[PDB]
């Protein structure tokens, strides 16, 4: 089609790998761009461990209101909130928060621990029949984001598929799903990513990512005026270790997508 040729044109121009995954809940159609090709998730996979704490909070009603201690050497390596809390506490709830719409990355680690470890988070996409994702380690290792090392990642398509059972669908209860939903429009790190390239009149909800090779990710659900919504997972990674970020990449073909629709 018209949109895969110019994907492809973008990924050309940009020196990179892209892959993107669309899903037009209006008519369940898909548009695929390495749909099935292996990505690093780095921070996107922050959505599947606050998800699967939504889902243990549906049988443990007040989960999310328990408070975790904060202590000096769970800092990692970025964690403008948790730092905030530093000899104190913040509820799971907060964590929650925190590591999607700050991507607090000492967040991910005490959701990761809250669930068993990676394998717990891993565990969880299992269930809700995501059978492509993988977390392995934890932070900042998981962004290591080397080529062709299929640890902490997935595809475009799992995840698509992923965040709109989540998001649109009913993987999670009423209450959870609603909470995940405002959490991700919510978030502050996407606004020269996904939303960059798309009307200012739509509502994103979005989860970014990045990582070495540089990583640039976003996942966003996009709830258009007067049109079904859409999930959109856009990946990009590069050759070079110390690459810079691209966000610009994932606007442009988030526009892309938007022409056409």
């Avoid at 403008?80 to 000899?87: F, G, L, S």
């Avoid at 680690?109 to 380690?137: C, H, M, S, Y």
């Avoid at 709830?223 to 990009?236: I, K, S």
Wanted: charged share 20%.
């Amino acid at each position: 089609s018209a949109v895969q040729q110019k994907l492809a044109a973008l990924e050309k121009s940009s020196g990179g790998r892209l892959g993107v995954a669309l899903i037009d809940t209006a008519d369940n159609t898909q548009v695929l761009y390495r749909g099935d090709e292996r990505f690093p998730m780095c921070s996107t996979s922050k959505v599947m461990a606050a998800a699967a704490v939504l889902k243990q909070s549906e049988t443990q009603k007040q989960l999310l209101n328990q408070p975790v201690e904060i202590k000096p050497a769970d800092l990692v390596n970025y964690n403008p909130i948790a730092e905030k809390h530093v000899n104190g506490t913040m509820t799971l709830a907060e964590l929650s928060a925190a590591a999607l719409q700050y991507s607090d990355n000492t967040a991910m680690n005490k959701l990761i621990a809250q669930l068993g470890g990676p394998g717990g988070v891993t565990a969880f996409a299992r269930a809700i029949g995501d059978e492509t994702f993988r977390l392995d380690r934890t932070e900042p290792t998981l962004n290591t984001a080397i080529p062709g090392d299929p640890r902490d990642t997935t595809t475009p398509r799992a995840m698509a598929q992923t965040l709109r059972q989540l998001t649109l669908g009913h993987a999670l209860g009423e209450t959870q799903r609603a909470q995940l939903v405002t959490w991700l429009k919510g978030n502050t790190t996407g606004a020269a990513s996904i939303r960059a390239g798309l009307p200012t009149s739509w509502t994103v909800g979005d989860k970014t990512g990045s990582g070495d090779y540089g990583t640039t990710n976003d996942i966003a659900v996009i709830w258009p005026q007067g049109r079904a919504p859409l999930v959109l997972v856009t990946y990009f990674t590069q050759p070079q270790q110390n690459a810079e970020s691209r966000r610009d990449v994932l606007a442009s073909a988030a526009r892309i997508i938007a022409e056409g629709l």
